[PDB]
Amino acid sequence: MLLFCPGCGNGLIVEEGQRCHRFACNTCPYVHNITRKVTNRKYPKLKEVDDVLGGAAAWENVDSTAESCPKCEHPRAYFMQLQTRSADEPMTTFYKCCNAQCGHRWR
Amino acid sequence: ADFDGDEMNLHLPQTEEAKAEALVLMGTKANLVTPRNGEPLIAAIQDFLTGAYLLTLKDTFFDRAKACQIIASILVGKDEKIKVRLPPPTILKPVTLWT
Amino acid sequence: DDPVVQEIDVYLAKSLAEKLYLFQYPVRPASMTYDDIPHLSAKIKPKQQKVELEMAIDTLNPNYCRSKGEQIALNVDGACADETSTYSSKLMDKQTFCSSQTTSNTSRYAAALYRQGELHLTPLHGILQLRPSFSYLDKADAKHREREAANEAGDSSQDEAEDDVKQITVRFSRPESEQARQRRVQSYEFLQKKHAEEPWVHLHYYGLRDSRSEHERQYLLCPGSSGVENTELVKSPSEYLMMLMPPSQPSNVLSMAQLRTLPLADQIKILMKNVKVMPFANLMSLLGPSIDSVAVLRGIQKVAMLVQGNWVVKSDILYPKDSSSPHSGVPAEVLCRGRDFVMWKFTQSRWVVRKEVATVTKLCAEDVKDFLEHMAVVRINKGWEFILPYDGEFIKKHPDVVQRQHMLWTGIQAKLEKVYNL
Amino acid sequence: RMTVGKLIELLAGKAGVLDGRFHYGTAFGGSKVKDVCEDLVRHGYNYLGKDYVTSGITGEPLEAYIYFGPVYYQKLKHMVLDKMHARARGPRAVLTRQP
Amino acid sequence: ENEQVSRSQQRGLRRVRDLCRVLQLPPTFEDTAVAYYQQAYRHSGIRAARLQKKEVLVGC
Amino acid sequence: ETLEALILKELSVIRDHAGSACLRELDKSNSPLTMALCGSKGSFINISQMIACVGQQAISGSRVPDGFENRSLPHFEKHSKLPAAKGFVANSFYSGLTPTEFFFHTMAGREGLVDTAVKTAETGYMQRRLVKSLEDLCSQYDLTVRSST
Amino acid sequence: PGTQMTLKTFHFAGVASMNITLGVPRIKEIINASKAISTPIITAQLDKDDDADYARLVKGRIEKTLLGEISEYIEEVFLPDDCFILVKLSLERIRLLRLEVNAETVRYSICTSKLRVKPGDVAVHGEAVVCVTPRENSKSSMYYVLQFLKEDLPKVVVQGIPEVSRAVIHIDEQSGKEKYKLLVEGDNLRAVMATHGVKGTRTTSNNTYEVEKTLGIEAARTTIINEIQYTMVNHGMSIDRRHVMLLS
Amino acid sequence: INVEIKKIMKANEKVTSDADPMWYLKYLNIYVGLPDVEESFNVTRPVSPHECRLRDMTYSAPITVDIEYTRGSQRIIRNALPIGRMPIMLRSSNCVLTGKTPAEFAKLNECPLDPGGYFIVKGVEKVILIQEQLSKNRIIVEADRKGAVGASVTSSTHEKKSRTNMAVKQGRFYLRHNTLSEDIPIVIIFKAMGVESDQEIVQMIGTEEHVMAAFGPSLEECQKAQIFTQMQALKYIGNKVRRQKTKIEEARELLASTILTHVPVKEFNFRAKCIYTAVMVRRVILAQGDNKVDDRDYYGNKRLELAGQLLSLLFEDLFKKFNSEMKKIADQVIPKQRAAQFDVVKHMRQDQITNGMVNAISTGNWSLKRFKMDRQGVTQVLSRLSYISALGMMTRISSQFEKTRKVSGPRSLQPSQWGMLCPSDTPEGEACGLVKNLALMTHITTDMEDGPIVKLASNLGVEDVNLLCGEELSYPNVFLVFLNGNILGVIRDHKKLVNTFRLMRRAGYINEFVSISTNLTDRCVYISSDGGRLCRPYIIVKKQKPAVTNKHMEELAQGYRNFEDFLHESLVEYLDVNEENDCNIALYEHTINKDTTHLEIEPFTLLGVCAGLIPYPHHNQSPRNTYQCAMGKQAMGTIGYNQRNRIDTLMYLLAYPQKPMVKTKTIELIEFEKLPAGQNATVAVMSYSGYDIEDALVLNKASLDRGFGRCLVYKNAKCTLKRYTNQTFDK
Amino acid sequence: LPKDVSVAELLRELSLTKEEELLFLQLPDTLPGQPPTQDIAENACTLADLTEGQVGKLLIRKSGRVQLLLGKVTLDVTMGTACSFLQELVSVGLGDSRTGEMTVLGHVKHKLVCSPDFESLLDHK
Numbered sequence A: 001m002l003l004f005c006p007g008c009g010n011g012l013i014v015e016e017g018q019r020c021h022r023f024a025c026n027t028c029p030y031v032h033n034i035t036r037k038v039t040n041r042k043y044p045k046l047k048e049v050d051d052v053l054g055g056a057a058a059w060e061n062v063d064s065t066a067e068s069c070p071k072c073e074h075p076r077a078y079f080m081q082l083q084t085r086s087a088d089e090p091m092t093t094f095y096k097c098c099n100a101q102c103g104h105r106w107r
Numbered sequence B: 001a002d003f004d005g006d007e008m009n010l011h012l013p014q015t016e017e018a019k020a021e022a023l024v025l026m027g028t029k030a031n032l033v034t035p036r037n038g039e040p041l042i043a044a045i046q047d048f049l050t051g052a053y054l055l056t057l058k059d060t061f062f063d064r065a066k067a068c069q070i071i072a073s074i075l076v077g078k079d080e081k082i083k084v085r086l087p088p089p090t091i092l093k094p095v096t097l098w099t
Numbered sequence C: 001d002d003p004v005v006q007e008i009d010v011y012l013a014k015s016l017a018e019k020l021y022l023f024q025y026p027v028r029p030a031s032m033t034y035d036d037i038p039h040l041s042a043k044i045k046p047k048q049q050k051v052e053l054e055m056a057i058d059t060l061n062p063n064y065c066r067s068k069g070e071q072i073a074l075n076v077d078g079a080c081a082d083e084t085s086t087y088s089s090k091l092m093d094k095q096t097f098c099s100s101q102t103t104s105n106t107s108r109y110a111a112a113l114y115r116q117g118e119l120h121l122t123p124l125h126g127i128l129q130l131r132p133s134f135s136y137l138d139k140a141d142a143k144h145r146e147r148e149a150a151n152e153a154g155d156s157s158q159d160e161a162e163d164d165v166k167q168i169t170v171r172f173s174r175p176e177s178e179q180a181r182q183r184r185v186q187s188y189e190f191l192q193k194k195h196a197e198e199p200w201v202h203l204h205y206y207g208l209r210d211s212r213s214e215h216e217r218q219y220l221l222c223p224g225s226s227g228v229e230n231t232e233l234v235k236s237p238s239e240y241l242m243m244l245m246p247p248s249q250p251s252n253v254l255s256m257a258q259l260r261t262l263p264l265a266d267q268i269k270i271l272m273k274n275v276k277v278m279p280f281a282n283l284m285s286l287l288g289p290s291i292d293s294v295a296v297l298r299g300i301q302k303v304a305m306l307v308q309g310n311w312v313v314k315s316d317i318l319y320p321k322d323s324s325s326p327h328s329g330v331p332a333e334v335l336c337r338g339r340d341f342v343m344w345k346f347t348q349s350r351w352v353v354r355k356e357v358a359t360v361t362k363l364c365a366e367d368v369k370d371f372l373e374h375m376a377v378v379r380i381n382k383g384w385e386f387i388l389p390y391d392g393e394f395i396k397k398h399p400d401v402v403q404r405q406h407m408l409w410t411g412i413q414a415k416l417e418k419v420y421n422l
Numbered sequence D: 001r002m003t004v005g006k007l008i009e010l011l012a013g014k015a016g017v018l019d020g021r022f023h024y025g026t027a028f029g030g031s032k033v034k035d036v037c038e039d040l041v042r043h044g045y046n047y048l049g050k051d052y053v054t055s056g057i058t059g060e061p062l063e064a065y066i067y068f069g070p071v072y073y074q075k076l077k078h079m080v081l082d083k084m085h086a087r088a089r090g091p092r093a094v095l096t097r098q099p
Numbered sequence E: 001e002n003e004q005v006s007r008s009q010q011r012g013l014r015r016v017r018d019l020c021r022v023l024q025l026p027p028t029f030e031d032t033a034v035a036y037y038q039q040a041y042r043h044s045g046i047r048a049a050r051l052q053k054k055e056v057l058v059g060c
Numbered sequence F: 001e002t003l004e005a006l007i008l009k010e011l012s013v014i015r016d017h018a019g020s021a022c023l024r025e026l027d028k029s030n031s032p033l034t035m036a037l038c039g040s041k042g043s044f045i046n047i048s049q050m051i052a053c054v055g056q057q058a059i060s061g062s063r064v065p066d067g068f069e070n071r072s073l074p075h076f077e078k079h080s081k082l083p084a085a086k087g088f089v090a091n092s093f094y095s096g097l098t099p100t101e102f103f104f105h106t107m108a109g110r111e112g113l114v115d116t117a118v119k120t121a122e123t124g125y126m127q128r129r130l131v132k133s134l135e136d137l138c139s140q141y142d143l144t145v146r147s148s149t
Numbered sequence G: 001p002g003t004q005m006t007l008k009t010f011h012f013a014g015v016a017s018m019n020i021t022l023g024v025p026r027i028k029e030i031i032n033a034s035k036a037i038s039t040p041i042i043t044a045q046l047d048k049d050d051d052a053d054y055a056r057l058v059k060g061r062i063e064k065t066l067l068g069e070i071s072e073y074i075e076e077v078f079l080p081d082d083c084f085i086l087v088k089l090s091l092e093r094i095r096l097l098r099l100e101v102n103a104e105t106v107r108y109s110i111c112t113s114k115l116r117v118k119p120g121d122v123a124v125h126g127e128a129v130v131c132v133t134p135r136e137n138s139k140s141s142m143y144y145v146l147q148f149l150k151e152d153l154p155k156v157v158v159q160g161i162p163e164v165s166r167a168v169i170h171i172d173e174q175s176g177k178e179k180y181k182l183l184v185e186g187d188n189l190r191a192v193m194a195t196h197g198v199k200g201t202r203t204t205s206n207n208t209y210e211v212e213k214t215l216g217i218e219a220a221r222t223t224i225i226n227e228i229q230y231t232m233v234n235h236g237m238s239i240d241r242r243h244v245m246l247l248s
Numbered sequence H: 001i002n003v004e005i006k007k008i009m010k011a012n013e014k015v016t017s018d019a020d021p022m023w024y025l026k027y028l029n030i031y032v033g034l035p036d037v038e039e040s041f042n043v044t045r046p047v048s049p050h051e052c053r054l055r056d057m058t059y060s061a062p063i064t065v066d067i068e069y070t071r072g073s074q075r076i077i078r079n080a081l082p083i084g085r086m087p088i089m090l091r092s093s094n095c096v097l098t099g100k101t102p103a104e105f106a107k108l109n110e111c112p113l114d115p116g117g118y119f120i121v122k123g124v125e126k127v128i129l130i131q132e133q134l135s136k137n138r139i140i141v142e143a144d145r146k147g148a149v150g151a152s153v154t155s156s157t158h159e160k161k162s163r164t165n166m167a168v169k170q171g172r173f174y175l176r177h178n179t180l181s182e183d184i185p186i187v188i189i190f191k192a193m194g195v196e197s198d199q200e201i202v203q204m205i206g207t208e209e210h211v212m213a214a215f216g217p218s219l220e221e222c223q224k225a226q227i228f229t230q231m232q233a234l235k236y237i238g239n240k241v242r243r244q245k246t247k248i249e250e251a252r253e254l255l256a257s258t259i260l261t262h263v264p265v266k267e268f269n270f271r272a273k274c275i276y277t278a279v280m281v282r283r284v285i286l287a288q289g290d291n292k293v294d295d296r297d298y299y300g301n302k303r304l305e306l307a308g309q310l311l312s313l314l315f316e317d318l319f320k321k322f323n324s325e326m327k328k329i330a331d332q333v334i335p336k337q338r339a340a341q342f343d344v345v346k347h348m349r350q351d352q353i354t355n356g357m358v359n360a361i362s363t364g365n366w367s368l369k370r371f372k373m374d375r376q377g378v379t380q381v382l383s384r385l386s387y388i389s390a391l392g393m394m395t396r397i398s399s400q401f402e403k404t405r406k407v408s409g410p411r412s413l414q415p416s417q418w419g420m421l422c423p424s425d426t427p428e429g430e431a432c433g434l435v436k437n438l439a440l441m442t443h444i445t446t447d448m449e450d451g452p453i454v455k456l457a458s459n460l461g462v463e464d465v466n467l468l469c470g471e472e473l474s475y476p477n478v479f480l481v482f483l484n485g486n487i488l489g490v491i492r493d494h495k496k497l498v499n500t501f502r503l504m505r506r507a508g509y510i511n512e513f514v515s516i517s518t519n520l521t522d523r524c525v526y527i528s529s530d531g532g533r534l535c536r537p538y539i540i541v542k543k544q545k546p547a548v549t550n551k552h553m554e555e556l557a558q559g560y561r562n563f564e565d566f567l568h569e570s571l572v573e574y575l576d577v578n579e580e581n582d583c584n585i586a587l588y589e590h591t592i593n594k595d596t597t598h599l600e601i602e603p604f605t606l607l608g609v610c611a612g613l614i615p616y617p618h619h620n621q622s623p624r625n626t627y628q629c630a631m632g633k634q635a636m637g638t639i640g641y642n643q644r645n646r647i648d649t650l651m652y653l654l655a656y657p658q659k660p661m662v663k664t665k666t667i668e669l670i671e672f673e674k675l676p677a678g679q680n681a682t683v684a685v686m687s688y689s690g691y692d693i694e695d696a697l698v699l700n701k702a703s704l705d706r707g708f709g710r711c712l713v714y715k716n717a718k719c720t721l722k723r724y725t726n727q728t729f730d731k
Numbered sequence I: 001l002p003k004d005v006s007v008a009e010l011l012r013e014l015s016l017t018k019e020e021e022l023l024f025l026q027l028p029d030t031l032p033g034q035p036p037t038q039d040i041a042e043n044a045c046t047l048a049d050l051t052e053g054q055v056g057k058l059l060i061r062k063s064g065r066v067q068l069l070l071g072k073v074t075l076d077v078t079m080g081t082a083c084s085f086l087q088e089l090v091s092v093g094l095g096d097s098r099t100g101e102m103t104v105l106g107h108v109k110h111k112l113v114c115s116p117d118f119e120s121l122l123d124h125k
């Protein structure tokens, strides 16, 4: 930890004297011998995440259900709408249909 | 272009060779497809897709006069030296209607 | 939430008003105190308060390094000079605490001593923060510099008598420019020299454990009865608020607060100029019930006329003699005549036709429209109707005012028939 | 472009010119659609702006009703007369002999 | 030219400038005044004179 | 982020279900629906936005960030993650948009505009570099593409 | 297509994380052939793609793990005889993450580019206890350099590749079988291929410089072609492969 | 022209030269007078702005001043001596157009509906756009290029501006300034500023465990060196001081005056500066964890400079230059000329200030060497395309960036622009997002005296910061109170303080434009009183019911009260962005809940002037509204009632303009219906002949023949016949 | 250590114990009074102008209200910044122009803040 001298208030460092390890300041003859054990834990953060991802139930966090696509007309789908282009007057669509492991990706 | 006030440039070549190269290489009929993926860019557009869609609908049934008028509406220019070739009607016994 | 209990009294004492100081150590917690530390002296100045405490610290304690003490003592002072030494012995024995001034004025701060049922307040003459000063290191650096100078001079075993006679280097006492003079005055060295010009005063220390502490602690109290009505501290809350917050020093520009500060006549004039249509009761409510009704009536009779029991501002009030029509540029006299004709038509009949007024007054459409909008509203299939209904109460209450306004309107009608040839 | 505000303005203007009023297009408010629809149905016109229209060219009625109404069109300073440009040989710059 | 302008000639032209500026004269007046001054300063008898002569010449 | 994704999923469910309901309730010969079917102009998404319900306003692929302290606008409570308080537009263009929804839509429009403005310059510079680098190649007669050297 | 590209977002490629630069900035980083690119992605195939235990094992093998991320507490204890830093390894978290790290591997991790700590300074007392006793180096360093150790002792690498910053387990849910692969956000393909359990024959990367330096110029050309085609397809627009082949 | 110019004259009232003492030039009082023209020979004459437009001259008033000086030690006083010409803004206090009726406007050939507020120089109409900049004297915590989260503070006083930064590049805090050779640790500066104990420094930084863990490396690096006293630290700084014990004095002067100019030291007492830098280090430490990085686009930290402040700075610079020139002329003339005593009146150049003002207004480039300010594009030519064009260009605001980089941050639409700036109104093009327009209902505050604010804060229990150590700054319940970036002190239970301050402001004892805000994340109570801040009126809501009732509105409609009465009776109050950040505003009455403090007056006030022309804008798309505003800024129509006598280089007029049938309330407010810029035509939405494929439209021949769309274009051709130096003229 | 309140503070100082305590309260700049025959002006009236004796009362209402009646107005007393460092209240009496006495009166632990009740002053008039 951070310790300060009661005399002048400067930071105390740990050195070795003639009898035992002691805290001392660099601007005053104040010292303090260590009698019992002193500890300073920090408890660093541990890795809690298992880093497992990609589940089909978690992936199907989308609105698209029971629609009709021009590729395989399967019910389960995955739609995305984009409006980030002023030159294109209409909007932009991205539809994916992987109900029977098709994996389509078009505009 | 979108016909919203955009200005376009028009150049006139001053050489027969340049004119011929422009007409051949940069011809409109010879550049109907883009070299990126071969998809045709010069095609139907708004007020042409909707018109052709409403025309080819199954509800459309035109008599002789309207069908002849719509056919003759294109008989201008180089199409003035060709026969009309009026197709036979689909329904004829109740009423003679051209789809 | 009533004061059920704890009705403590507050007393005031002026015994130690000029002798009470507050010493706080920002680096020393309240747990450890300086009661057991033997003090030696305290330097202080009456003006520009800056106290320097000089205390003594033990050495035989295990929390002191005698070797480092000898080292720092040999560093700060000489070998055996001892003429001006920061420490008497060869060890660091004396400690210096320097005070910093928190604020200039401490009148708003007071110390409170609490006894059973009473709280005594005592003003503070000054507040200073005591911090461990590092001044022996500066003298140590000066000693090191002079030792380096001595070593430079002693490069040779025997130094010949140097012919370094001090040539007269008396510099011109040049007249300093006012900017440079202000820079010198605002310099830190000048302020430090001015502070040092004041002589120091030495004081002894008396700890809390001493009998003198408990002897002088009773001076914070004051001899007085339990219940005494203070002669001062009797100002109203409004006066207190004025004390703690001293002041710095279209036609509707003046607000209501600025209006109420104006005389009654000016208030009535401005209100009739702004609204142009208002009853007497509304005027009495706006001006306030503390104003007599006769004064308000006499004031409104000068700038307003009676129309169907209501009060309408006069034409000359809205249009001064130097003004003109903002739409046509005609003189204000014609506007006043037209407005008087409109008001006469309204007094004769509640319904007024705009076309008839435009034909008689020979004015444009916009002027007649502005004249009618000020006192009328458009009713379909009926023309223009007065905005306020017939107020018969004021008519029944003041018959003499009604008769005077009736004869004034008769004179105005005579003038209008003379002018417009009605 | 989803300019329903233009249709609402057209309907409000039609209702206003029918009943002799000035409808308000105030943001987050103004005259509602029900009021202008009632104003249209009161004067004998359609409550949706679409009216029976006959084609001027062929003289036959159109299959779909046309959306008529007064719209406040404003002309812009961009004119074809000021933007039309043509360059002959003409002058050149002193530094670089270019137009 | 304009480099063989003596310190006195520079002072005279600056005097003309400030004199026509304090009167709030248009720049055409300043141009005409400095032109007249440069034309009158061509004489040998005028260039060799005191400051009073140059100042009254600026005034004239 | 899990809560954000769940709320976005619920709002998208509302949007798509309202769009499906509007497309089912609309009758034929409808000019917007007709132009959307033939693909001449517009789509079903624009129809659903202008008739049934406007979608979630997405800025940089996320909800409206908190411009003020712990909230997007002072009209909503602090630390409030409600849909209408983060960019959702319940009303459509026909019924009229609330001031908050209109402000969010204007934010999205300005974001798209500045994105396109930066994209134009970036792609112009990239195209200039690519053409200046690739202008030397040409197809020879021996079916081998060779450089100028 | 650069003008046609909208520079969209939310295109996490199905993992809902690991924001990658795609679009015109991606094409620019590709054509510039920079040695260091933004957000490098490395795809590694597994020999046992059906077992998640082996996937997490090879992940811990390839992912860099710091000392502070696995130790439960690090305390500077100043005993009356000597002062030293005691690090307690969390064996429970170690066996949870399936890391092949013990007290000996931790001790071997120290004394490597850490102010030249001698092997006698670091010692092991228990099963998961590491005691570090530094000495003064005389180069303006005393015993009160212990604090300096507290600044960088938890930030030492004990297992994994230093260049690897983050590795995740991606899963493919194909109807035939759900297979497991490694997505590494690092810039070291050779180390990933050299690790045990990783099928290096089917390992790709996004950084063209690493592919060029590791697997030849033709592998770099193929990587450039595939990456440009993928970036173009992500925006829904298609380009003939001959153009990107000529560019590469 | 009424207050600030007198203060500027008082600041430089006395000017004297070093040589020949007892000589001085004392200014007494400066007047601007009425606008006049110097066409007549030494005679002034009242001139209308339209005459200035026609004659291609400037519309200015002669700035004169009364003075007293010493010619030959005999004091001579001058009561009326013109010194310059200040261009008079139209419709100002001294302008001839104010206080006039529309008939008098017709007599002067000026449109009564003209907004005014623009200068007329050399016949052209120039408008000074509202400048937008970052707030001064504020700590900004931001990430660097390498990701390091550092801090910056641009301390700007009336004399000098200095931006000092602090970084954590190597786990320790280094302070960087332009007057230092190399960045030095913060602990050395702490030791140099009086506080030498490390314990006090740590207490001032913070008492949290993570705070000490972060500040540890700095203490270690400081203990590595032999710096332990104030003298050693000052010597080290002086060694690090760049050229412009002497080094110690220079270091102390730089620490006291140059570094943190906004933080004042009474007499070399750096206690306030120490607390300020400690709070800055604490904020940096707190930001080094959770990424709570402040954003630059937050308009609560923006300041708007109008034409007044710019003209004040320009006049101050010009007056200082004139005084320096006069002192130089005196030093050159008095000591060697003659016994003829020199006087300043013979050298009072009157064209200096006039030419300076004319050039700064016309060219638009402002170069202030005294402040090192080099700005361009300050003034712009007023667009006379239509009434809407000028009315919208008059309320424009430019950005400080000025297209230096496509950041896309400030170009975006921030939520802080609510009620202050129009969201949709923005020029389409490269300037999208950098040029904005004010809202319909907005106001810009001015500077206050700041005296009663300090008095009320001291009387409200705010303890002095010098009385306690920095440890109290680490307490969770102790909240810091600031004042324009200066640490005002500490307080406990800030809710009572804020409530009392707001109640006192509503009562009238405190100016209604003084803003107060509270940040619970940083636990800081900001009290803003400087000018340039944007405020918006809001109806006060107390206990789920607004203070404004139907009776108050009836009295307002009848004329019993005005808006000032609503302000005085604690009914409607102005809220700043920082203040509304903590308040709860309700859009409508039905939205009012228990936790509501204010009510929105009108929602459609969110839009600007141009966006108000859009009928039903909430039913359209935002790019559509932007394009509509852009085209309305270029719409053709009538300009004013004096458009016939007006002679401009290019004018577009409509033959038969008609007011719209669907008009917004903003249109009635701006009186656009009196000057329409379009025509109502019977449009039929349909496809015809295929000549309207993409955005095109088909026009009727008979309609165009009967006058629909007929337009008029007026161009100007100017020629000058000037006389040259020689006695010859153009004929 | 929980944050105490002035009412409970005085209650435990008087009911729980009887030992005296030294407090340090901060009074406003101007007191609601007039300097008695101090040669004036509406200037500041501090404790240096008032005389000895009873000058005000300390009331403790319900719900934790702590007020100070200094005449017609009533201020409120709240807890100040909880100082933890050493604060020694001493008396420095300069009896002689050459030698003086410093008397340590006691220690300061708690700090009070007295503030005007502006709400009551506003609703009064």
Ligand SMILES: [Mg+2]
Pocket (backbone or CB within 6 Å): B001, B002, B003, B004, B005, B006
């Ligand atoms: Mg276009």
Ligand SMILES: [Zn+2]
Pocket (backbone or CB within 6 Å): A004, A005, A006, A007, A008, A009, A010, A024, A025, A026, A027, A028, A030
């Ligand atoms: Zn010490």
Ligand SMILES: [Zn+2]
Pocket (backbone or CB within 6 Å): A069, A071, A072, A073, A074, A075, A097, A099
């Ligand atoms: Zn399918």
